[PDB]
Symmetry: D2
Subunit: 483 residues, 4 copies
């Protein structure tokens, strides 16, 4: 019923609190204490000091063991974490159990393992006097990492940033989304119980503008800011940290495409586009909101998708056979519904959905919408260019390989793309021409945590994952010995 901040080893309240609302039924889950500027400073100062403490003296093997203990602590409370994620967001219990929570445990274990095996470089060189010199690099913590995370995959994305930060020996001040504060608070309890030293991990609650989020980005004591969320928010943050020339790592919006070629396994493609459009009710940065299907199979694709989409069970997270929960909030539902209207006004054909389901129970006070498919829009329509972040896709026919490549690339975004084809040459030839961070062939959101992850253009800045995270969360320093 109440969620506290976690600062310098202590759970602490605040002068103000805000409502945490279950989107299944509009009911109050808890009140959340909002950290103010003083508390943010206190968090950052504590993190700075923690760097000079026992955390700073741990060997890499011991730090890694301790991180493995955080992962163990989450596993030990697995079902509590599931319930926490579910309550905040309305996501299906099965998704929380298979995707959200196990990925958070894996995030810690993977970066603990990387931290342990990573090494640096030795460069030998000749000099004028014939004695030579040695250059070697070492890996130091960057310092205090400020973490700001979104609500689509709360624990997953939170720990995606927090785990490599800690693995590289940094200290952390982390601000989860106001819409999904619960699993982050549980994680803070796991950290405390695991004996993570005071000040190493700090959790602050609040909003962005004129709240904890902004105060973090403005604090001169942080060394870097890592952020996942809206593109325009990324621009704001970059401006905020600019005077301290802080390092930044961004994963921002997309308007991602799926492309189905005539030679695709059609049933697999229909199935694939279904999950890529409607997973988490379409509320993943990685979702496909534009779909291009070859003309010769377009009608059969749209027909098959319509059928599968209409079979999707929209209901309670714990309901048998449920496929979709609600949107995160009423405010977000208002945005999505305003796009549903905008699509009609723009001339779209509503193949399916386009409204909100009727339950005749508590769920009518929730924030549900229906899975929606449009056709008939131009490539320039706002509904096909702007990110909606709802369970929706527009499907469009295409004819030629180069044509569709140009159409996928005709965007200010470039996060990810999914391609369906059985042809060897086409798969590799087309993939390399798509201007995004991630291309999937005959699948979607399939993740190896070692790979580079991120987007080009407005979709991001930098890369994370594997060695790219080890690079960002570390200060690589060069030492030259004249011999």
């Amino acid at each position: 019923s109440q969620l506290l901040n976690y600062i310098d080893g202590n759970f602490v309240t605040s002068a103000s609190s805000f409502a945490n609302i279950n989107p299944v039924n509009g009911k109050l889950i808890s009140d959340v204490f909002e950290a103010d500027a003083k508390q943010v400073n206190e968090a950052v100062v504590a993190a700075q000091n923690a760097l000079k403490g026992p955390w700073g003296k741990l060997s890499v093997q011991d730090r890694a063991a301790l991180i493995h203990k955080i992962a163990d602590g989450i596993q030990a409370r697995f079902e509590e974490f599931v319930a926490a994620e579910v309550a905040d967001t309305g996501r299906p219990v099965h998704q929380a159990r298979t995707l959200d929570i196990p990925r958070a445990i894996a995030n810690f274990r993977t970066f603990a393992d990387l931290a342990k095996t990573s090494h640096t470089d030795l460069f030998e060189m000749s000099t004028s006097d014939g004695s030579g010199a040695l250059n070697y690099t070492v890996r130091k913590p960057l310092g205090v990492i400020g973490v700001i995370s979104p609500w689509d995959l709360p624990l997953l994305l939170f720990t995606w940033k927090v785990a490599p930060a800690l693995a590289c020996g940094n200290t952390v001040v982390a601000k989860p989304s106001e819409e999904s504060p619960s699993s982050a608070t549980l994680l803070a309890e796991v950290m405390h119980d695991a004996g993570v030293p005071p000040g190493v991990f700090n959790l602050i609650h609040g909003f962005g503008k004129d709240s904890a989020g902004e105060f973090l980005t403005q604090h001169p004591g942080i060394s870097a800011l890592t952020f996942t969320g809206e593109s325009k928010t990324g621009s704001t943050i970059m401006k905020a940290v600019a005077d301290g020339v802080k390092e930044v790592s961004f994963e921002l919006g997309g308007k991602n495409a799926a492309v189905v070629f005539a030679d695709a396994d059609l049933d697999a493609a229909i199935e694939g586009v279904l999950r890529s459009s409607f997973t988490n009710s379409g509320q993943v940065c990685l979702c496909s909101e534009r779909v291009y299907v070859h003309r010769s199979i377009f009608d059969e694709f749209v027909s098959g998708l319509k059928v599968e989409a209409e079979r999707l069970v929209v209901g309670y997270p714990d309901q048998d056979g449920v496929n979709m929960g609600p949107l995160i909030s009423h405010g977000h539902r208002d945005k999505v519904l305003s796009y549903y209207r905008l699509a009609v006004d723009e001339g779209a054909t509503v193949v399916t959905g386009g409204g909100v389901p009727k339950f005749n129970d508590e769920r009518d006070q929730g924030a549900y919408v229906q899975p929606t498919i449009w056709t008939g829009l131009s490539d320039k329509a706002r509904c096909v260019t702007e990110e909606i972040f709802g369970p929706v896709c527009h499907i469009s026919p295409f004819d030629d390989e180069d044509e569709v490549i140009n159409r996928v690339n005709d965007s200010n975004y470039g996060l990810a793309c999914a391609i369906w084809t059985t042809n060897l040459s086409r798969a590799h030839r087309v993939s390399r021409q798509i201007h995004v961070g991630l291309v999937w062939v005959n699948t979607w959101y399939l993740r190896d945590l070692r790979t580079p992850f991120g987007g080009v253009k407005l979709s991001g800045l930098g890369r994370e994952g594997g060695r790219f995270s080890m690079d960002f969360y570390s200060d690589i320093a060069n030492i030259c010995i004249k011999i």
Copy 2:
């Protein structure tokens, strides 16, 4: 007498021009045509288009071979490049012959080779269905790289950015310092004569605010901005590209320290600090302006360094035995002299220098100052904390190793540091505790081009050099094949 812009394969003039003045004698060298917003736009569009032309079709081996040809063409005009860099900046001819021009040639060769040898990653994974998946990464050009370079090592820093940009298959719009435009204009001729396709390399002349530099940073058509220069300028550029979320790479100011331990080779450390403080008349980001010397050798060090500083020949670039030329400009001299006055005001002892030499010839119309040594200032003094960028160092005693490490690190900058000690443990123990991008032990500015190069805190953002350059100037894309 005239320096043109180079846009889309053609040398073009402009409506306005500005003076290029020789700092040795205050005389006019050339008129430089200033690119306006329209010309900057034309350069960017031409760069965008060149990406889809012949340049985009070259194999990695053919691109590398052409970049080697650029290097060859500089080499074939070696003495012209020397005379250009000298005329603009007043640097001694011997420095231009040994440092500036050869490093510019070596920059191209190094990144050409790196481009031929670099590869990417293959990740194998298991899937639920037991068929598995492949993730592989590919290296693509990022796009159009905006380059803005400073006047301290004009061609070296210009090519430091341009070489890896081209080696990675990018196209370039580059704006060199208004104080040192000549060698860059010469490079454009080499580019043209070598057969670099139109639009691949574009040179725009001008200033920062309300001029070519600002127009470049604000153009939506660039994919990245790499910049070396003032720290506050870095902040301005970060703000300016934030709306487009552009990749940025910064090498900024420094207030670098040298530390001389009791067990140093004293005569070598004196000579070392002389070189680190007064090379290029102290106008390098890497120069030492703070010097800490063990108490037991402090008086001897200061006396030794005074004698050597007064031996330095300050004069014409090709004068016999010359060690120091003038500062870059009268405006920069006004800044430096302003700090010379501030130091006396803050209670400094002037061990030597402190003013301007009197030549009683045309050099009196140039921008010379004396090499200057201060003692007696507090660690809080402005002259000890703010980057001056002239031929000066303050020398302070220390007693204790941990004390001196704290005093070195007590700075909003962290670019480089030089340490003098003959003790094995001390060299490695102390070095790793210095919070800077580069440490030298028993030398200074010894460069291996494969090392990471950059600074921490206000001194930089990101790293370049070796694979760090190959990452920044590349778009690293992940492709996932479900099998």
Copy 3:
């Protein structure tokens, strides 16, 4: 014409000599002096002393520049090298001009570049006393490398070993095949004229047993033995160096398969198999001598291949549209023909060829055979299991993917395989299951010099190419500093 040994900077003759015979017409090309044991010792001692000369003092940059001069020297005498390869082996002039000689040049250039860019490792560790330690590795020359090469790709395979050896700072004693000693002798001239210091590169001529090859392998002065050739010879050499526990690197025989799946591009597959079976008259270790074609397209494949094999031009190296020259020698032809008879005895159907062409000119005194195709042999037949090393292939149908994988792997060899398929999944799924060093999909013998190259089982020992050559030809040494 005469071919001398090259020892300690000098061309020298020997007590004994043998004939170099043109396989096109059986005429004498030159006399070759056979090095005795005394001269082999002299070469090895010279190479040992060369490690302590000026060669050992060169910077990696300077050594790389010199290697680039060797490559320049071959390029400057390109057609002389083409002429020499062709004379010894009868290979088409077009193959020599496009494959053989350019690869030899690219071998030197690639490893010189690799030597310039390559670095080693830095490992930090904690210690009980809390002060830590550093482990760093350095790359040293291994010492004297013994090189023994075969006659199939004479200069290519010779420089494939010699180039990385020199690039890693080693010295070399090299014994080319008695059947192809010309191009290597010319290479010795290039080395001498490029100013390669005396003893760095030594060339000895002769045979295996009781001759230069054996003497080299028995000499205690070498640090490693690298070898390409027959599998049994590999075993003999391994025994010979065992008393000195010398490092060895072997690329040995193969009985390589090609697999054509039903979804293949049939015309391309036919042309591909033609190439992989008959290139260099089937005298490449990488050639396919067993072919598996899906039952549904088997007859059509065999018909198509027969027609193409019959259009092949067998004749003079510079003859218009020539596809195949002779075999290396009459003795080799004796072996290949004996297998032609054996195949008939084992009950093979001779689809085409199976004899020797009748020229009615000087070529009838050469060592030509016809390109040959067989069907109807069981998987256990000697001709399907033993390496023939001539222009021949057996074709057999298959039904099942798992079945054909098993049949390809049912072999004591494991060098290479080519598979033909347009299916994305199939290419990757099948390729990873083939127990060979190298798989090609929809091509054959397409080389990127950075990749690992070698065979499993009886087909080799170790890998070369890229970092694997850099590792084999270097002493990687670990240095640990306790801090």
Copy 4:
């Protein structure tokens, strides 16, 4: 007690057994069943078959998880492993507790982690038709690994080979020293209880010639032979596998030097050399048996070492304050004593030791010798050049740096060297000149498991540890896709 073989998941007896003798007192510990040729074959065939079973189907994550369970199993029986190691070897309990057993556990954990994190390479290339090609590598099990280990660090060295072998997906047939079979037998129990599939790990007991060791090396079913032990045995083994061209990896003898410069911390160097000479009663391949001390400190060094050596407590493994236990066996003691006499015969001064201690108890029936120090021998003396493998060192003075470097390098061996100096330049300058696999500066036998580990010359063949192990125990295969 009895020690059985472990073949295809079953503990089995043999036709013959041999005695396992406690070297502290000469009493019988157990009878050990000696595997015959038939049982060796059964073990190899079972290892082959296990590759095609459930073991072959584990994901890299699952295989790693299971290898961690093996480590967990050892940890759970920690004191039993200690007792087994101690009983077989007479090693001090505190050594087994801190070095031997924890390293066996760490071997498994380190390679499990490396297997989880390791990835391979992607190479892009251009082709004539302008479509390009992809080369990528994959990591496969080599096959069946034959492991032969020595008695000096039984479980440590046994798991040093077995852990990476299993981590890379191989199956194992492993033969421990007849002198120390107990801990390896306990390990098979741990494997069994952890649910390692039958045939994945096989333990065969026995001798070398005409026994399990020989039979394993000559078996055509193994893919590789990894071996630590005597040099001459390495030669024997290299010959035995030659007919199969098996991959081999050797860590062989040494005659290692320590060098103490005048500027060393003398006290630390005396303690360091005491540890390097007498650890495990001088029975480690890495022990120093030759010591060079600068003449200015020679007498003080030798006097101090004499004092510390005489303070060494030689006795029972669980004796209070024990430093040294017995040698491994009476047979080994006879060898070491023959060297003690030989030293006297070539004119040595015995500074201390030189015989066997008189205990007047059951230990007199064991295999004890005294820690021994010689001076007065020339560099050509057999006792200064041949590996003794007992608790002994000769100390010689030196004058010049280049002199002592030549004397260290004047050896058919080159495993390791330790150097004592406080001078920064000297440390790096001298270290890189010692022709061995491992140099320690101001320490000895400090191990980072990521570093390359092995010797040059007669001391080894190949490298293990880190990526070097990952390379040797893996088949790295290239796949080339033409696009």
